[PDB]
Structure formats: structure tokens, C-alpha cells
């Protein structure tokens, strides 16, 4: 499995924020398109300007994008259009629109379909809550909207898990859960999909954590909150070797 | 008041598509600044597109964005980052998002209350259902909803509100220049005894809803309609003798 670095920029910046992020993303030094796979995630208004200014061995993610096909949605923005605009890559299923968009388990599960079905690959993110994990169904929750993402759909899909209830987070809970969402894939869709998908970390990831996780033999990579903001996203992208 | 002609493009575009609307409008002749003031709503990716090509006498809107400011909110668009990229309009309160994405009442409110402390200009839409109209509740659903957004703030100026009855969205069936003027003209009372007089006197409330180029005339004639919230027509070189019925 390719080693996988996304950064989800969220709900934030600035055009002069946002040339500041690129450019010294362009002049970083990292493994090669070979040795690991980088996605860089801006918000929709500064997906084009991302776009023309970033160095081409990095890759765009939207943050989001609807359930289906474009028309009477005002607000949203389509998979259709996304493809329209050179944007190869979506989130979708991300913690923060699960929680506090109340995005269904099959409502992501629909969305992901449609992007795939349209071209665009995704990182499809799953997680359990602190109150969820409390009471002992961490694997339970996160095999359910493993599950409705799989009712519907796999050669273009990156699975990211994101320990929502974190607290301090081992790296051995990090382990733990990825060979079980892995075994998931295994015993529901088939060894071939278990051996080749990747499952991408996405707790707090810094360049301070990031080297302990990313030797956890079923840790593929990392969804990188708040430090993909920062220059040392590009340490976190060294972990790959 | 001055007549006020918003375009809602809604999930709709591809790069060429936009460059051909936005030169059907640049090579448009319709009235003045003084006479008609013209926003256009594209989709979040194509903003800076059409902030670069368009006319620079009509002006942009977003077609939604966050309740609050921006931090940890995946795939939400934040207030201050439209005002960044020099975007002075947003449509809030859209019906498709009420409905489809569960858009409360309150919620709206503080997504206008928000957007207009940022320095965004809001076209706030309100509407009421099928249902809601066929049981003779019509400006108790309009009232509500208004109320639900100006009791969030202190300020009403920057306010636009859009009268869209949910059953004339995309279906086809118009609201009557009679139907549109009732809600309106009842609407502006509200205002005025539960705002203000003068904010009741300024405030535009334009009609949306299956608003065409044929139908357009007769609505604007009617003293409480301000203009119009256009929908699919506003993808049509159509969306120019809309503007023209100033
Ligand atoms: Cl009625
Ligand atoms: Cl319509
Ligand atoms: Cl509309």
C-alpha cells in the first residue's frame, strides 16, 4: 500500500494565507509521487486558485461535494463540477459534517457512491465519538458506516479514521482499530479490497506525532487537521519513508 | 426603494457555461445603477471566475455560508472568507436548504445576524409550503420565518427579503401579481409594527418563483413588489428582460 498524506485545510484562509501555504509547499523537498501520494484540501472558493498555483505531484481534494447529481441545490456544489474544474479528489463523510451537519451514515454513503461513479476519488472518513467509545462501541459504530458506504459502492477509495472522542490516543489504539476496520473489508467485501485499500489516521496529526503512528503496520498515512495549515505538514509527509 | 434583480444559478455550471452567461450579461443593455440594482449567484467554485469577468455595475452573491466563523467546519464557507475574495452578496435561507438540508428557522437567523455583522450584503428568502398556503397559513409561515431573522439583529439595512412560495420553486406554477402583492404588501406591515416604520418604508421584498421573462411585467407593477429572485431563467439570456422590467 502507497503511503497517503491528505491535509484538510477546513474553514480556513485568506487568498494571502493561502499563497503563503502553496508556496512553501512548492518548495519542499519530499519523497517521490512513488513513495507516497499528497492531497492538499482548500475550501471551494480557493480550489481553482490552489489549483493553477500548486506544484502538479500534489493533488486537490474538495471538502465536500452533494449527493448527487447538480441542479435545484442552492449552496451546494456537484462531483460534475468538481471534474469540470480539474479537482481529481473529495472528502466526504468527515467528522465535522456527520456531527454538526447531521450528514446520515447513508447520506455519506450516497455521496460517495455518486463521486465514484463520476470519476472523483475519495478519502471516505468514519469515526466514533467519546460517548461511543465510553460505552464500548468504537468498532460497532465505525463497522456501521463502513458498512453503508460498502451497501452502495472500491479501487478509488481511501478510508480515514478519525478518533473523534480524542484525551490521549496511542498510537496502539490507532493500531488496533485500522486492523479491525481492515478485517471489516476483508470479511464484507473481499481479502483483495482488505490488502490493497488504504485506512489513513486523521487524529491530531503533527510532525511530532506522526512518526510513531505511520510505522503501525495497518496506518497507510494520515488526514492532517490543523498542522496541514503549517509547515510542518511537509515533516508529517516525510514519515512516508 | 430600488428595484432589485437577484440571478440564483443554484448547483449549475461548467467553466464554459459561466463564461457564456457572464458575456450574454456583459454585452446586455439594461438600466442604471440609479434604476435596478442586479446580483448574480454562482456556485462557490466559480466566485473568483465571475468576480474577474462580470460587469463590474452588478454585483455577486454566494449562495450560502457558515453560522459563525470558520475554524474546524469541513466543506463549509465562511462569511469572512466571501469578504476576502471581494464577494459583498449571500443568499440565505434558500428553501432547497430549509427543506433539503433542514435549515431551521433560527438558524437562518443567526446565519443572516452573522453574515451581516462580517459586512455581507443578505437576500434573505422565506416562503411558505404547498400545505401551508392550501390551510390558509400563509403569513403566519412568512411572519415566523421573517421574524425568526430580524429579531437576531440590530441593524436591518443591508436586509433584502425573498418571498419564495415553496410551490412556485421550479415547478412552473407562478404566484398571481394579486397573490404576490397580498403577501408583500402584509409582509411590509409586519415591518412596520413589530420593526419599524421606516424599516418597513426601505426594506425591498422581491418575489421568487417560476419568474419569467413573459410574467415578469405584471409582478413588478404591483406597488409592494421590489423585484424579483430568479431562478433557472437566470441561466438564460432571459434573466436580462427580468432586469429590464424595472
Ligand atoms: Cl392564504
Ligand atoms: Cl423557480
Ligand atoms: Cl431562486
Known sequence: RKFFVGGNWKCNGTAEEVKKIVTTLNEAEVPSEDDVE????????????????????????????????????????????????????????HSERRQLLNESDDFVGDKVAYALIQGLKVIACVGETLEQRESGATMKVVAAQTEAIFDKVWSNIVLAYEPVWAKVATPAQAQEVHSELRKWLHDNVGPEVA???????????????????????????????????????????????
Not at 489516521?201 to 506522526?210: F, L, P
Request: include cysteine; charge should be neutral.
Open 195 to 241: 490488502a490493497s485499500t488504504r485506512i489513513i489516521y486523521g487524529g491530531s496529526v503533527s510532525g511530532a506525532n506522526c512518526k510513531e503512528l505511520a510505522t503501525k503496520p495497518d496506518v497507510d498515512g494520515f488526514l492532517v487537521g490543523g498542522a496541514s495549515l503549517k509547515p510542518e505538514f511537509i515533516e508529517i509527509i516525510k514519515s512516508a519513508t
Open 38 to 93: 499528497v492531497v492538499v484540501s482548500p475550501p471551494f472558493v480557493f480550489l481553482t486558485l490552489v489549483k493553477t498555483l500548486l506544484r502538479p505531484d500534489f493533488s486537490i481534494a474538495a471538502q465536500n461535494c452533494w449527493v448527487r447529481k447538480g441542479g435545484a441545490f442552492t449552496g451546494e456544489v456537484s462531483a460534475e463540477m468538481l471534474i469540470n474544474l480539474g479537482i481529481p479528489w473529495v472528502i466526504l463523510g
